[PDB]
Amino acid sequence: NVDLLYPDPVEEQRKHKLKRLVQGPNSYFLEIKCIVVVYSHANTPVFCPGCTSQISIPTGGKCAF
Amino acid sequence: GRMHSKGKGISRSAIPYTRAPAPWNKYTPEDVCEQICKLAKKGTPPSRIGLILRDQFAIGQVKNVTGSKIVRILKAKGLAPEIPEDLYCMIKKAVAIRKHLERSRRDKDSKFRLILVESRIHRLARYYRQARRLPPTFRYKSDQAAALLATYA
Amino acid sequence: VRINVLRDALKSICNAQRIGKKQVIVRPSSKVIIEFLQLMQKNGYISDFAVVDNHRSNRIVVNLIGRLNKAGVISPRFDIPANDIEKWVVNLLPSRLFGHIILTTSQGIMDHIEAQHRQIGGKVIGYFY
Amino acid sequence: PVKRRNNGRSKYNCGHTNIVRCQNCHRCVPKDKVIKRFTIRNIVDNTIADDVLNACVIQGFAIPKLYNKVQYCVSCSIHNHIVRVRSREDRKIRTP
Amino acid sequence: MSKTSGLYTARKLRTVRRVNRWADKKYRKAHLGTWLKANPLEGACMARGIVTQKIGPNSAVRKAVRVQLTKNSKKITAFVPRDGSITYIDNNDEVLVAGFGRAGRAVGDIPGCRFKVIKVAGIGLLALFLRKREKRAR
RNA sequence: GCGCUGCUGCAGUUGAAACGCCCGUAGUUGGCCCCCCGCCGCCACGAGGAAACGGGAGCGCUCCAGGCAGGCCCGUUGGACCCGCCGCGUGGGACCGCGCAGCGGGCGCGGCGCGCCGCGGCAGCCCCGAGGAGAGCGGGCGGGGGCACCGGUACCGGCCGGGGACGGGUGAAACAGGAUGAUCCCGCCGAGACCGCCGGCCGCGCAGGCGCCUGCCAAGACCGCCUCUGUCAAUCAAGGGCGAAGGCCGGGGGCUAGAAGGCGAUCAGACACCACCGUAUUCCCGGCCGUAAACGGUGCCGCCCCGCGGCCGGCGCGCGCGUCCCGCCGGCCGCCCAGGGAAACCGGGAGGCUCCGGGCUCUGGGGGGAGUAUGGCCGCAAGGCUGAAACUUGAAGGCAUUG
Ligand SMILES: CC[C@H]1CN2CCc3cc(OC)c(OC)cc3[C@@H]2C[C@@H]1C[C@H]1NCCc2cc(OC)c(OC)cc21
Ligand SMILES: [Mg+2]
Ligand SMILES: [Mg+2]
Ligand SMILES: [Mg+2]
Ligand SMILES: [Mg+2]
Ligand SMILES: [Mg+2]
Ligand SMILES: [Mg+2]
Ligand SMILES: [Mg+2]
Ligand SMILES: [Mg+2]
Ligand SMILES: [Mg+2]
Ligand SMILES: [Mg+2]
Ligand SMILES: [Zn+2]
C-alpha cells in the first residue's frame, strides 16, 4: 500500500527539507503588478520602477508587500 | 553552534538538484560579470553581493550561469581582498570586544568570549597559512590588530 | 563525528529486521557498502536494493525477507594470513557449515571460502549470518 | 537506593534557586522544595458575621477577607499533618 | 569506546597495562621487593636456627618457641604442632624451621605465629613422634 | 585455576571507581567522490642464511624411554622435508595515505638535459557543495553579563505630642525594660541592608549561578534563506582561564542576624538543645586561597529506535479567523510496549553486548593501616596537588524477603 521509493507528493510536503528523500528549496519566485518577479523570502529592500520607495516589509519568514 | 558551545541546530540552505538557469533568464555571464565589479568597487563583501543578486536581480545561484563562483571571478579580475572575509569579520568582533573591555574591566563573560574568538582566529589563520592563501609571515597579535584591519581593508 | 558508515548501516538494518519491516533507508552510499550488499544479495539475505542520487552522499534503499540473524563490522581492519583463518572462523561464526566472513584482498572483495580456495589472505571487513 | 525520581523537589533546567524561610521554625529552605498552601478567610469568623453586619452602619458593607501564603518545611508539615506518609504505590498520585 | 582501539596504539596499551598491573596485592607482594627484604626467611624453603625459650572461641594454648636464625640474627616464633613434642625440644637445641601452608600470613587460630618446627638435632619430628628413630644422642 | 590485569576479553547510577567547568599543544582518530601513473603499508611466492631441541617420512634396540640404523638380489640402500628474519627480489594492487610547478612537435647529434621556435597540434588548465564546520542577512526570545541612576515598605535608633502601669519572653518560667512615664497610637528625622505576594515538572547561562525604576555598552543560542568558504573537524597529558559558602591581606562603611564570649533556665551533671546581650563576619573596592552530597552520585562526539501527552521559542499550511488545528526544527519534562539488569529501576538509555570490535580521555582491583609518614611543587597563612610501606584481618559491602 505504501512504498518509500515513491513517496506521496503531498505527504512529503509536511516534512523537513533535509530529511526528504531529495533535498530541495522551500522558496520560489512570484510575479507582482504595481510585471516584476520577486523572491518569496525577501529580506533586503526592493524597489519598483514607477515606485518612489520600498514596497517590501521584511519578516522572519515570508515577506509582505 | 558546536565547536565552542553545546547547542546543535540545523538551519541551512538546500540548493536545487538541477544546475540549469531559469527559463526566464535574460543575462549572459557578461552582464553579471561587470555587475560584480561595480559592487566590488563599492567595497561590498561577496555574501552581500550574492544577497543583492538574488533579491534584486532574481539570480538564485551565480555558478549555474557563469560557471564560476564570485570570489574566483574577483580574483581573475584582480579585485579579491588579501584577507578572506570571514577572518576579517572575526578580527572585527575581537576588536570590538577588546574596546568594550578597555572601557570597563569587571565583565568576565566578555573575556570568555574573547578567549573563544581568539582560539577560532588562530585555528583559521593557521589553516589559511597552509594552502598558501596568506603569507607565512602573517601573524595575528592583540595589540596591533586594528592596524592590520584598516590597512588591509 | 560520523566515521564508520558501514557500522551504522548494518545496525539500522538489523534493528529494522528485528521488528520485521520490509524497507530501510541508509544515508551513506559508499562502494564498500555496495559490495557488502551485493554479497548479501547473492547469498540470499536481503534481495533487492536501489541507490538514490542527490549529489550529496546518495541514499540507498534495501528490502528485507527475514533470514538474517546478525551482521557486524571489525572496526580496525586486521591482516589475515591465508593460513590463519580457522581461528577467526571459530571465534566469530556459530558453525563451520554456514556463515560468510568478508575479506578485502588485492583480488577484490570476497568471502573466506573463496580466499581459502585460492590460498590467499588479506584484511577483514565484517561478517553476517 | 533512590526513593523518588524528582529527588524530593521540583528543580528543572537550573542549578540554583532562591531560598525562603519556614513560617513556624524559621528554617531556610529552597523555594522548589518548600510546601505551599494558599488560603482565603474572613477576618471575623463565621459565627459572629451576622452580629457584625447588624452592628455595622454602612449599607451593603462587604466583609473583607485575608489573603496569605503559608510556607512550611518538610519536618513541620509532617508534624502538623499538612502531608501524610503514603504507601509505595500511592506516592505516584498527584491530585489534591 | 572506553578503551583505545586504533591501529597505531600499542604503545599506550603497553604503558597502561604496565601502570595498572601494580594494583594487585599478590603481584605487588611478589615483584615489589619489600616482602623479600622483610621476610626473615629470605625466600628460602626453610631455615636452620637456635631455640632460646619455650612458651605456649577455642581457649586452647598452643605450644611454640622463640628462635634466632643463624644467618639473619632476627627473632621469630615457630610453633611445634605434633603432640608431646614440647618435651622433645630442649633449650638451646639446633632446629630447622619451615612455613605453614599460607605463605606470610598466620594460619588457624594461633595469633602471631607463622612457622613450624620439623627437625631437632637432625631428626625429623614425624620420624620421632612415631618412634621410628630416637634422640639418645641429645 | 583467573574473563581477579581483560588485545581476543573486566568494571565505572546505588557494590571500589567519570577530573567542578571551559580553552588547548604534543598524541590518537578523521565524511563522500576520479577504473588503470609513482611511492608506504598490506598479501602471496622466492632467494639467502648453523646444527641440536620441536614437528615429521622410514627402520620390531625382545617392547619402551631411545638411536639412525639395517638386509640381502638394497633408489647410487637410507638418513626426506619444515621451523630462529621487523632486512632483499617478483607479482597483485582491493583497502590504507601522499603527488604545488601544462602537454605535443621542429632546431637537436643515439638518448637525457639547458634553451630558441607556430600555437599551426589539445575540449589546454575549477567533481559536487556532506540532516560536518565556520562566516553573513532578517526575526523576534530570555531572573544571560557590566556600568551609572533609582522607589518601597520593614528591622533599628532619636525626637514632638497623648495616656497612665505594667511590658517582654516561654511548654512553663527567669535574666535584661519601666513614675528619668515604659509598652501602645501618630508624625518627622538618619543610616545601612533587601527586592516580596506575581514566582512556575516557565526561562537564561560553560559551569559556579541569575528577580526594584530608568538609561547606556558589548554578547549569545535558535529559527527562516536556491547568501559566502571549501574539510578549515572530534577528543585530549603539559599549559592557561573561571570557579558557592566559609577564610586571609590592605582600605571603607557599622542595620539586621550572629561563630567566640557572657548570662537565665532544664538536668544527676548540661560549659548543648530553649530565652536574652553580643565581637569577628555578613555589605563595597583591589588582591589571595582553589575547595563542596561542586549530584542527574550517570564523561565528550556520532547513528537506529513502540506509542501517548504537557510546556517554551521560531516558521509554515488550512479554514468557518480563533491568539483555532495540522505539521517542521530546537529545548525542558511525565508514563510506558519491547529490550536490558543482582535487583531497585532505565527506556530523549542504564537498549542495539558472552550472538560479547564507531572514535578520544580519565579512574578502579577484598577490608584496615591511610589520604598517614617521607620527599617535591604551589600558598602570607589556613592548607591544596602528588602520594608508600611494614603490620593486621575473614569478612566489609549492594538490592531485595519474612519477622
Ligand atoms: C528531658 C528534657 C525535656 C523535658 N523538659 C522540662 C519539662 C518540659 C515540659 C513540657 O510541657 C509538658 C515541655 O513541652 C513539650 C517541654 C519540657 C522540657 C523539654 C525537654 C526536651 C526538649 N527536647 C526534646 C523533646 C522536646 C519536645 C518538645 O515538644 C515540642 C519540647 O517543647 C518545646 C521540648 C523538648
Ligand atoms: Mg572541541
Ligand atoms: Mg549536528
Ligand atoms: Mg532510607
Ligand atoms: Mg547545585
Ligand atoms: Mg561506589
Ligand atoms: Mg566570603
Ligand atoms: Mg563525582
Ligand atoms: Mg566487550
Ligand atoms: Mg573485579
Ligand atoms: Mg585494598
Ligand atoms: Zn515553621
Total number of domains in chain A: 1
Mark whether C62 and C81 lie in a shared domain: no
Q: Left if phi > 0, otherwise alpha if psi is -120 to 50, otherwise beta: which for D7?
A: left
**Alpha carbon distances (Å) from B22 to B25, B52, D49, E49, E78:** 5, 17, 85, 108, 104
Mark whether C87 and C28 lie in a shared domain: no
Given an 8 Å threshold on Cβ–Cβ distance, is C25 in contact with A4? yes
Mark whether B88 and B125 lie in a shared domain: yes
Ligand 10 centroid to Cα of residue A64, in Å, is 68
Way the structure was solved = cryo-EM
Return the partners of chain C (3 or more C-beta pairs < 8 Å).
Answer: A, E
DSSP C106-125: TTEEEEHHHHHHHT--EEEE
Domain boundary among C16, C41, C68: C68
Number of CB pairs, chain A paired with chain B, less than 8 A apart: 32
Number of CB pairs, chain C paired with chain E, less than 8 A apart: 5
| Neighboring chain E residues of C76 at a CB cutoff of 8 Å | 5-7
Range list of H helices, chain E? 10-20, 25-31, 34-38, 125-129
Mark whether C42 and C29 lie in a shared domain: yes
| Neighboring chain E residues of C77 at a CB cutoff of 8 Å | 7
Q: Resolution limit in angstroms?
A: 3.1
Given an 8 Å threshold on Cβ–Cβ distance, is B52 in contact with A43? no
Mark whether B91 and B137 lie in a shared domain: yes
Beta-bridge mates of residue D36: D71
Cα–Cα dist E95/E67, whole Å? 9
Q: Left if phi > 0, otherwise alpha if psi is -120 to 50, otherwise beta: which for D81?
A: left
Beta-bridge mates of residue E96: E48, E119
**Interface check B42 vs A, CB under 8 A:** no
Domain that holds residue B102: 81-151
Dihedrals φ, ψ of B2, to 5°?
-120, -45
Cα–Cα dist B135/B83, whole Å? 10
Dihedrals φ, ψ of C128, to 5°?
-160, 160
Q: Please indicate if the annotation marks B7 as binding a ligand.
A: yes
Nearest 5°: CA angle at D36, between D34 and D41?
Answer: 155
Nearest to B88 by CA among B50, B117, B130: B117
Give the number of whichever ligand sits closest to the CA of residue D4: 4
**D12 contacts D24 by C-beta, under 8 angstroms:** no
**Alpha carbon distances (Å) from A56 to A42, A44, C40:** 8, 8, 58
Ligand 8 centroid to Cα of residue E20, in Å, is 22
Q: What element of type H or E holds B88?
A: helix B85-103
Give every CB contact of residue C107 below 8 A, 6+ residues apart in sequence.
C118, C120
Cα–Cα dist D47/D6, whole Å? 44
- Min Cα distance E58 → chain C (Å) is 54
Q: What is the dihedral of CA D26, D27, D29, D31, to 10 degrees?
A: 0
> Distance, angstroms, CA B147 to C1' F31?
39
Cα–Cα dist B89/B99, whole Å? 15
| Neighboring chain C residues of E5 at a CB cutoff of 8 Å | 75-76
**C111 contacts C102 by C-beta, under 8 angstroms:** yes
Instruction: Please report, as a single letter, which amino acid is at residue B150.
Output: A
Mark whether C57 and C106 lie in a shared domain: no
Nearest to A30 by CA among A17, A39, A20: A39
Cα–Cα dist D38/D67, whole Å? 8
Report the chain A residue with the minimal C-alpha distance to residue C23: A4
Mark whether B88 and B132 lie in a shared domain: yes
**B118 lies in a domain?**
yes
- Min Cα distance C50 → chain E (Å) is 33
> Distance, angstroms, CA B59 to C1' F262?
89
Domain boundary among B80, B102, B121: B80
Total number of domains in chain C: 2
Residue C6, number of CB atoms within 10 A of its CB: 19
**B7 lies in a domain?**
no
Mark whether B73 and B114 lie in a shared domain: no
**B89 lies in a domain?**
yes
Dihedrals φ, ψ of C117, to 5°?
-65, -40
| Neighboring chain B residues of A42 at a CB cutoff of 8 Å | 55
Nearest to B31 by CA among B74, B6, B66: B66
Total number of domains in chain B: 2
Q: Left if phi > 0, otherwise alpha if psi is -120 to 50, otherwise beta: which for B51?
A: alpha
Mark whether C103 and C82 lie in a shared domain: yes
Mark whether C9 and C64 lie in a shared domain: yes
Q: How many CA atoms lie within 13 A of E67 on its CB side?
A: 31
Could you give the angle at which helices B46-56 and B29-40 cross, rounded to 10 degrees? 130
Domain that holds residue C112: 69-129
Dihedrals φ, ψ of E117, to 5°?
-105, 125
Whether nucleic acid strand F comes within 7 Å of the CB of E2, the answer is yes
Mutate: best of C75, C77, C79, partner E, most E CBs <10 A: C75
**Alpha carbon distances (Å) from E116 to C5, C32, E77, E96, E99:** 68, 71, 9, 9, 6
Given an 8 Å threshold on Cβ–Cβ distance, is C54 in contact with A23? yes
* Residues of each annotated binding site of D for Zn(2+): 22, 24
Residue C51, number of CB atoms within 10 A of its CB: 13
Given an 8 Å threshold on Cβ–Cβ distance, is A4 in contact with C23? yes
**B142 lies in a domain?**
yes
Cell of D43: 477576618
Tally of helices (H runs) and strands (E runs) in chain E:
4, 6
Cα–Cα dist A47/B24, whole Å? 20
Cα–Cα dist C25/C9, whole Å? 9
